[PDB]
Amino acid sequence: NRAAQGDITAPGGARRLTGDQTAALRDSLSDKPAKNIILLIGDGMGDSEITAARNYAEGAGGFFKGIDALPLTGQYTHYALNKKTGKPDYVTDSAASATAWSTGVKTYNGALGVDIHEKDHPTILEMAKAAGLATGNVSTAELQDATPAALVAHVTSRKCYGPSATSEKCPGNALEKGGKGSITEQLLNARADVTLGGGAKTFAETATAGEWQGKTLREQAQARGYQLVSDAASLNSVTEANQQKPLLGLFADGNMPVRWLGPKATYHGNIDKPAVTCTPNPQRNDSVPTLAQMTDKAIELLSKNEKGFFLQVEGASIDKQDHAANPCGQIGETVDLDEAVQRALEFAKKEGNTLVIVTADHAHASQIVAPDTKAPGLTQALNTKDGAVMVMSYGNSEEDSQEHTGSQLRIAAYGPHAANVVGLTDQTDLFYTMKAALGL
Amino acid sequence: NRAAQGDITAPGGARRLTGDQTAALRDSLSDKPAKNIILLIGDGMGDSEITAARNYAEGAGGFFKGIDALPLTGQYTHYALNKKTGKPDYVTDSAASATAWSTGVKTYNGALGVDIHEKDHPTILEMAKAAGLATGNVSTAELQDATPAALVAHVTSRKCYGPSATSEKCPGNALEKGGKGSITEQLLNARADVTLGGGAKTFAETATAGEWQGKTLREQAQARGYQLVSDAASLNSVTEANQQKPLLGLFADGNMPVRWLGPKATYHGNIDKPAVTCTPNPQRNDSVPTLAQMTDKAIELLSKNEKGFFLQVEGASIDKQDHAANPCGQIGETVDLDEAVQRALEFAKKEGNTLVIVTADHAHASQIVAPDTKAPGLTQALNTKDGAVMVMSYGNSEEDSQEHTGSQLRIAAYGPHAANVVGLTDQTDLFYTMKAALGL
Ligand SMILES: [Mg+2]
Ligand SMILES: [Mg+2]
Ligand SMILES: [Zn+2]
Ligand SMILES: [Zn+2]
Ligand SMILES: [Zn+2]
Ligand SMILES: [Zn+2]
């Protein structure tokens, strides 16, 4: 572990290390092939987000048993491009960044699986499937959202959820104009073995052309042999997932509900309002699977393939709650991701040939500031595990969405080929790292 | 080399890695002793600050030949303590943080070289000297400032620069009350072989007790055998520095001048004012030594000791210009630190037994944001090396000083014992890493 080893007020009591690390780090370095990869993404989970959640949930000297437990660490860059000039755009969205690690090419904000010239490039998930590996795509967001969509769809705008938006916003991609289709249509073609998340709403739309013209996208999925599930009990009862019977779990109309409840941050909230304690969200029913439960099921089903598997797992609402200036929502989604990381690491340590990677798509707004801060944006005081107040600040937007930031951020890894995240890297190096680890 | 491969618009063109890193990382791991340590601190140089400076000076896909070139990387925590309760204080100042890496014990904001019970703890510099090693203390700040002062002074408040302030603010430390004296008086007693920086102003004060009562602190230094220098020519002439003839360089009245000028960020500055291009500060001339020049001279003089040396080098005004909401000042001080890191790494690679560490004391205010941002704080657009606009935001204070933030941040190392910075560590682990590397 890397918790403080004793009394933080005494000499050495805040140390996270118990002895020299050179031998242990040598033991962590393997260049043998990866059989499997599990990539876990905390959307908007910069170093600031990791630290705030640790401080609140584990205490300043505590330790995330998942997120903090991966031994090989570095910092990576995630800048996008300006579509017209090809020059860097220093603050990416989720679409350009997910395109970078899934294809190895930089692109413009809002693009999925295409470059600045609108040309398609293959994804790591498509490549894994072509090599005979099992494939998984898990998220707490609607499945059409940028982070899961980038693995399975090639469209010129992330807004192209279904046929209706695609005809308006991506006419080159629209099925009735000869394109590959909307995000949801391309997801159904991609046919991952396991796809789990939200986003049932768009499946009520009808196709405009092709074999399933006039049928809903839900009807199409059923006709094409998918197993559709909608709650925890139906998910748990699934005993196989493969190309004959692929699994599609749709657990909410839009995004899945967050784990923790608290109030929104406000102007001078740390001064004028009481300190807050986060609580379990009553508007999340127990019939909704957790991220860790979805991860466990995916691992169980995918690991039956003896050649190997690729799995991406996204803690999507770290970012979404950071936009909403809601510390409890944001921290609870970080704690939720840590639970899923623990399931991945436990599997990987037993199996011995699995590369596990934990990172974020970009940095975000939240900052940890002094308790008496008088700031111009939105603030809130929180009562942490240590029995002390922490203040968080959201200071980069006068509009009601706090925005992404451009700082480089932590990437961490465990298992074969994990050395390739150490030092300064780029988000596009992660594509090449995964490709080489699996020998694709 | 970790610059982008080539055409960032093309597949693989933004990669920083040319191949697998496993073998090279194995070669980077040594548990042999360190003969020497060079610790470089960018005050306030969080991941955001590194990224902003790289984007501006080197381009998004560029590479700092010093800062980015250390192979072994992690993230460390720098929380302080509440003096009364002993619980964490999530946002440190410069005094508590410098006390943590130099002594191995956490303390309260504003403390130098003492714990929450006001007990003195020996510093890494005092320990190195006691073991017969040479010692250096270099900064672009006034030498009484917290970062250099923590190595050589034990006081209950960082405000205790000289006799006057100490009598008022630290009566227990005042020389005339039976204490050990002001920061400047304790620095003169500590007698490092090499001390270089600003802060001549306080040396005009006169002592209130002791052997040198009624003499200025400059006169005291002269009487105690110090070699006093004041400019680049007088520094370069120095041929030796040791306990018989210790070196004290005082190159400015207060802080040394910054390298680059630009205007302060303003409300809606990215919207209402044109983008800024930095320009050199006319106050810089060949008579004021640069941080890299001070670093090289220190290494030359300290390396005469055949047992070894400990050297701390501080890029102090990254933090000070971040407080002032001045991107050009902040960025130019980061470029300045990169030049000094290059000198340290060049020496260490030749010598082969030198541990070099680059990190920060705490994170800071500045954020990289989208060009069209409408923020409630202070903002500015900048024209970067790429020929594109970057916007920076300072959003955490309604007062004229933008404030520290609590996020964990990058620590990087090269040489013997460098494995001990990888993964999650605490700032107090850095004390123990340095102690064990030198076999103290
Ligand atoms: Mg996302
Ligand atoms: Mg300082
Ligand atoms: Zn995102
Ligand atoms: Zn976002
Ligand atoms: Zn500082
Ligand atoms: Zn400061």
Curated annotation (Swiss-Prot), chains A, B:
Keyword Mitochondrion part of the UniProt annotation: no
EC number: 3.1.3.1
A GO biological-process term: protein dephosphorylation
Cofactor info, note text: Binds 1 Mg(2+) ion.
Record-annotated disulphide pairs: 160-170, 278-328
Family according to the record: Belongs to the alkaline phosphatase family.
Name assigned to this protein: Alkaline phosphatase
Species per Swiss-Prot/TrEMBL record: Escherichia coli (strain K12)
